[PDB]
Design a protein around this ligand. Structure first.
Ligand code: NI
Length: 460
């Protein structure tokens, strides 16, 4: 019965198996050359930014906000949007949409430089030790007497966050659920693993490794530094300003600077206006001198939706494609790989070369973004007869970039199974255009294989 009110716990039907992700990857890519294209010497590097991007935009949305799902995630991923209301996942699943709903008509993305879409990525903080994440959602198709079921909740419900995990959204600690008088360094330290246990229980055993400092409270940074699961942190002050082409040290347990760009009072400007102005100023510098645009957000809204579209249209897929728009966790892992991994390429015979590198995350937990870019200097796509890869490589795209050759290598252990889960969702909702688009997006992440061919056929 479509018309009957239901009050449900929002749930998604699969979550990537973060707890099962392998910590250590061994990449072996065999490049067989055409007969009259024998090259003499090749050498390799991991570039400063993934996909050979010129500059970095980091986004972390604080306070575990409903709008992180209803506005930020929905706008990026081509989902129904509202101007004043706040959908939960169960509304989208059931087609119970607010009375002003609309869609942008596209996802918001860069490319990877080798012909594939990379949707914008961001992180949200989590109030995992707060029972308000267990709030129910009122679903009632066709009910128009009121729209109270679409009002802003005080925070994300778990199901919304669980679904966001399937799209690579990251997580961070923020406030912990203790009485204010108990927010001492020692008591916050004891409460971190309590919140972590709830994160792991709800997010298919993903371990949170980031702290976004709350309200300038340095007790959170001091406590977090004694909790070794936290590897990366952000704050507005007492931090390090990130210059991606200059930063040379370890950033393990380093507080990265992140700004909210609040507008002057009574100025009528918005946070997106301020960030846009900061971006324009920063782009006037050569890329090597640019700071990262490292932003925090609180509530996101229509102005933020339009700003994300502006980024897409200006520096993303529909503009100059120069930006890497990601979350701080993915960046942290990539920087770690660039510091510690050493790609090597060896000639096996006159026409065959073998590229190897290891991706090994830190001892605390499996890294969750085990993908890199490798550049090969001296090689062009036109030289290549075939490329093959070993089992640890699950996504592989490649092509020319400037005067060299680039490979985007994804080693997420369960990526093919994840794509198939999106295919199955489309098959169960074949009239949902967005479900089909998501299926195509995830299947296109896979390297060429029988499984990729099977899944493409299922989504023709
Ligand atoms: Ni906050």
């Amino acid at each position: 019965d479509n018309g009957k009110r239901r009050d449900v716990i929002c749930e998604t039907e699969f979550i990537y198996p973060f707890g099962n992700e392998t910590a250590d990857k061994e990449i072996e890519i065999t490049i067989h050359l055409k007969a009259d294209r024998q090259v003499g010497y090749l050498y390799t590097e991991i570039p400063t930014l993934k996909y050979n991007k010129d500059w970095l935009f980091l986004m972390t949305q604080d306070d575990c906000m409903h709008s992180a799902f209803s506005y930020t995630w929905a706008a990026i991923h081509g989902k129904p949007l509202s101007y004043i209301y706040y959908c939960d996942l169960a509304h989208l699943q059931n087609g119970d949409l607010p009375p002003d709903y609309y869609s942008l008509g596209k996802t918001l993305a860069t490319t990877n430089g080798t012909g594939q879409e990379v949707r914008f990525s961001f992180g949200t903080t989590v109030a995992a030790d707060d029972d308000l994440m267990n709030t129910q959602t009122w679903v009632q198709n066709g009910y128009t007497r009121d729209y109270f079921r679409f009002y802003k909740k005080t925070m994300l419900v778990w199901g919304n966050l669980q679904e966001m995990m399937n799209y690579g959204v990251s997580i961070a600690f923020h406030d912990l659920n203790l009485p204010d008088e108990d927010k001492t360094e020692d008591k916050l330290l004891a409460q971190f693993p309590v919140a972590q246990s709830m994160i792991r229980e709800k997010l298919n055993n993903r371990t949170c490794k980031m702290l976004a400092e709350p309200n300038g409270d340095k007790n959170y940074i001091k406590a977090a530094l004694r909790y070794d699961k936290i590897r990366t942190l952000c704050a507005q002050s007492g931090a390090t300003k990130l210059y991606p082409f200059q930063e040379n040290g370890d950033i393990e347990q380093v507080v990265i600077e992140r700004a909210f760009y609040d507008p002057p009072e009574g100025s009528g400007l918005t946070n997106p206006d301020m960030i846009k102005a900061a971006i324009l100023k920063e782009m006037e510098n050569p890329k090597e001198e640019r700071a990262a645009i490292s932003i925090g957000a609180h509530n996101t809204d229509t102005g933020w939706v339009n700003f994300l579209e502006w980024l897409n249209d200006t520096y993303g897929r529909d503009g100059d494609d120069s930006m890497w728009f990601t979350n701080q966790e993915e960046y942290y892992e990539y920087y770690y790989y660039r510091l510690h991994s050493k790609p090597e390429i060896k000639q096996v015979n006159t026409h065959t070369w073998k590229l190897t590198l290891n991706l090994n995350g830190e001892d605390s937990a499996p890294f969750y973004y085990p993908s890199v870019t490798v550049n090969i200097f001296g090689l062009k796509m036109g030289d290549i007869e075939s490329i093959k890869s070993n089992e640890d490589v699950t996504g592989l795209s490649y092509g020319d970039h400037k005067d060299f050759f680039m490979l985007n290598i994804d080693c997420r252990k369960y990526l093919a199974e994840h794509a198939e889960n999106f295919v199955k969702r489309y098959e169960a909702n074949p009239t949902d255009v967005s479900a089909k688009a998501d299926a195509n997006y995830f299947v296109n992440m896979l390297k060429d294989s029988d499984k990729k061919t099977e899944l493409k056929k299922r989504i023709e």
